[PDB]
Design a protein around this ligand. Sequence first.
Ligand code: E2J
Length: 351
Amino acid sequence: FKFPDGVQNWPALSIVIIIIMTIGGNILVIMAVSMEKKLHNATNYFLMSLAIADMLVGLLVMPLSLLAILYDYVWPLPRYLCPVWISLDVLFSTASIMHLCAISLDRYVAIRNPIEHSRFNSRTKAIMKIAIVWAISIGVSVPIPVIGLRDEEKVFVNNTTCVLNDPNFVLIGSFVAFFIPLTIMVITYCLTIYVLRRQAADLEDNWETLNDNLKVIEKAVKDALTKMRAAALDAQKATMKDFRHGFDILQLKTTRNAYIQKYLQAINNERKASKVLGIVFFVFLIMWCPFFITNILSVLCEKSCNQKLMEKLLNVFVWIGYVNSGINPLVYTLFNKIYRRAFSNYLRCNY
Ligand SMILES: Cc1nc2sccn2c(=O)c1CCN1CCC(=C(c2ccc(F)cc2)c2ccc(F)cc2)CC1
């Protein structure tokens, strides 16, 4: 570990900046979800446990990858330390996709069959769901120290570079640890975003007409006045008892701000959450695709392919996937005033 004698790529040390921003960024997420009241809920507990995995990627996987780059991918640490790092790489990377898939799956199940959650509270129900995503993650990574130490060629190429080299494990494992959870996250997300739009459009299309027909009354009628009573007529047929009669009493603009905005902001809130999750989901998908494509493209042709080129591309493609462990705290800041406000305060009033 930085002898320093023997190092062959000193400008690679500049990747430390990537490492520092991946740890500190997710630390702030851990601080925010731990301290902010308006962030204490199942979805944001998922993000904290996710930030714990992404912080441990930058804390335990990124530094030992950088060290290998510094020695031209000739493993500089003891040989037993290679399969330990490979399993820590697999564990925390799987925990990332397993968190995103669990968020999208729980959000989908929360919408289809929203039965009265009478068994446990939301805080404690989240704890079990976080336990299964870590239980699976440990389950995928725990064979690797066995396979690697029992047979060192499964984790060493050319007896020098430390990389996972078991084709059966890499193939089957890529399905269990990446392809299946990614397939679930995409379908559940889109299916969720389809249900949410159909149910919101029920009230929205009635609330949109009443609003538009109010503009013509300020243009500036007996057809536009009855245009607004028919709007609320269909709105009050779907939404608790204070809502049905709430429209039946509706100068008009004051009633809209009095009680309609209670649900109007509620639906917009659900829309803003689907926006953030989709960006987090599909940026994760996009930043891991080049590595996974190039990898699964490297075994579809055993020969007839430039294997030397594949490895060189994968050296860069793995860090495109790694940088994703730092991207999530940035995304929260851009799209949520609670994270952005807490982040600026932790950077100032604490640091
Ligand atoms: C550090 C490094 N450097 C170089 S240079 C040239 C190659 N190369 C490498 O292969 C690696 C290891 C990359 N490492 C990324 C994390 C891994 C996942 C995984 C788990 C188990 C598998 F079976 C299949 C892949 C994963 C990826 C995304 C996820 F969302 C979840 C898991 C394991 C592979």
